[PDB]
């Protein structure tokens, strides 16, 4: 649900959004869409501050649900002890 | 016309949400009909049928609103199915 189903449309980006800002929305939308289905969980200058506010909160929450409900880190260490 | 078609479905669904077809040894009592599935509850087509079924093997012995991109009703069903079993499973132990 990460590699596919999301495409940055180069044609319909408004001029008043820089090409880098358009990759922070495609990443906040994907971070919430993936948090619901697969993870199985449910919950200008002020404009630039809104994107970053929606970034430094959603992503920081995605790791918490991915380290407490699934222990993503505890598998990396365990996948070195045995498989390596 | 989106406030309207929400006023109809909010009122044309109270009878359904107050009661899957029944029959007359226990897997033929209640059975899912495949056509009449809302296709947004298709994810939980088995927990609904399993939620009421447990309520009947005990009864004969002795609010939901629709929202888009918000799953407040999908979560509301799991909160009752997680109790529907804890009253029957405890009833047999």
Swiss-Prot record, chain A:
- Identify the domain of life: Eukaryota
Which tissues is it found in, per the record?
Ubiquitously expressed.
**According to its UniProt record, where is this protein located?**
Cytoplasm, Cytoskeleton, Microtubule organizing center, Centrosome
- What interactions and quaternary structure are annotated? Component of the gamma-tubulin ring complex (gTuRC) consisting of TUBGCP2, TUBGCP3, TUBGCP4, TUBGCP5 and TUBGCP6 and gamma-tubulin TUBG1 or TUBG2. TUBGCP2, TUBGCP3, TUBGCP4, TUBGCP5 and TUBGCP6 assemble in a 5:5:2:1:1 stoichiometry; each is associated with a gamma-tubulin, thereby arranging 14 gamma-tubulins in a helical manner. Gamma-tubulin at the first position is blocked by TUBGCP3 at the last position, allowing 13 protafilaments to grow into a microtubule.
Q: Which family does it belong to?
A: Belongs to the TUBGCP family.
Its function, per the record, reads: Component of the gamma-tubulin ring complex (gTuRC) which mediates microtubule nucleation. The gTuRC regulates the minus-end nucleation of alpha-beta tubulin heterodimers that grow into microtubule protafilaments, a critical step in centrosome duplication and spindle formation.
This protein's name: Gamma-tubulin complex component 3
Question: What is the originating organism of this protein?
Answer: Homo sapiens (Human)
Q: Which gene encodes it?
A: TUBGCP3
Swiss-Prot record, chain B:
Q: Where does it localize?
A: Cytoplasm, Cytoskeleton, Microtubule organizing center, Centrosome
Which domain of life does this protein belong to?
A: Eukaryota
Summed up, the tissue specificity of this protein is:
Ubiquitously expressed.
Assembly and binders:
Component of the gamma-tubulin ring complex (gTuRC) consisting of TUBGCP2, TUBGCP3, TUBGCP4, TUBGCP5 and TUBGCP6 and gamma-tubulin TUBG1 or TUBG2. TUBGCP2, TUBGCP3, TUBGCP4, TUBGCP5 and TUBGCP6 assemble in a 5:5:2:1:1 stoichiometry; each is associated with a gamma-tubulin, thereby arranging 14 gamma-tubulins in a helical manner. Gamma-tubulin at the first position is blocked by TUBGCP3 at the last position, allowing 13 protafilaments to grow into a microtubule.
Q: Which family does it belong to?
A: Belongs to the TUBGCP family.
Q: What does this protein do?
A: Component of the gamma-tubulin ring complex (gTuRC) which mediates microtubule nucleation. The gTuRC regulates the minus-end nucleation of alpha-beta tubulin heterodimers that grow into microtubule protafilaments, a critical step in centrosome duplication and spindle formation. Plays a role in neuronal migration.
Involvement in disease: Cortical dysplasia, complex, with other brain malformations 15: An autosomal recessive disorder characterized by global developmental delay, variably impaired intellectual development, speech delay, facial dysmorphism, microcephaly, and varying degrees of cortical malformations including pachygyria, thin corpus callosum and subcortical band heterotopia. Most patients have generalized seizures.
What is the name listed in the Swiss-Prot or TrEMBL entry for this protein?
A: Gamma-tubulin complex component 2
Q: Which gene encodes it?
A: TUBGCP2
Q: Which stretch of the intact protein is present?
A: 372 to 504 of 902
């Amino acid at each position: 649900l990460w590699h596919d189903k999301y495409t940055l449309r180069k044609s319909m980006i408004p001029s008043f959004m820089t090409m880098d800002q358009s990759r922070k929305v495609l990443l906040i939308g994907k971070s919430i869409n993936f948090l619901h289905q697969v993870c199985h969980d449910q919950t200008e200058n002020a404009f630039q501050g809104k994107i970053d506010a929606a970034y430094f909160e959603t992503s920081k929450y995605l790791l918490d649900v991915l380290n407490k409900k699934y222990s993503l880190l505890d598998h990396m260490q365990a996948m070195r002890r045995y498989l390596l | 016309a989106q406030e309207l078609c929400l006023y109809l479905t909010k009122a044309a669904s109270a009878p359904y949400f107050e009661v899957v077809e029944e029959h007359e040894y226990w897997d033929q009592r209640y059975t899912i009909v495949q056509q009449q599935i809302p296709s947004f509850l298709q994810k939980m087509a088995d927990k609904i049928l399993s939620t009421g079924k447990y309520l009947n093997v005990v009864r004969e012995c002795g609010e939901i609103i629709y929202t888009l991109k918000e799953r407040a009703y999908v979560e509301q069903i799991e909160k009752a199915f997680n109790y529907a079993s804890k009253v029957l499973l405890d009833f047999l132990m």
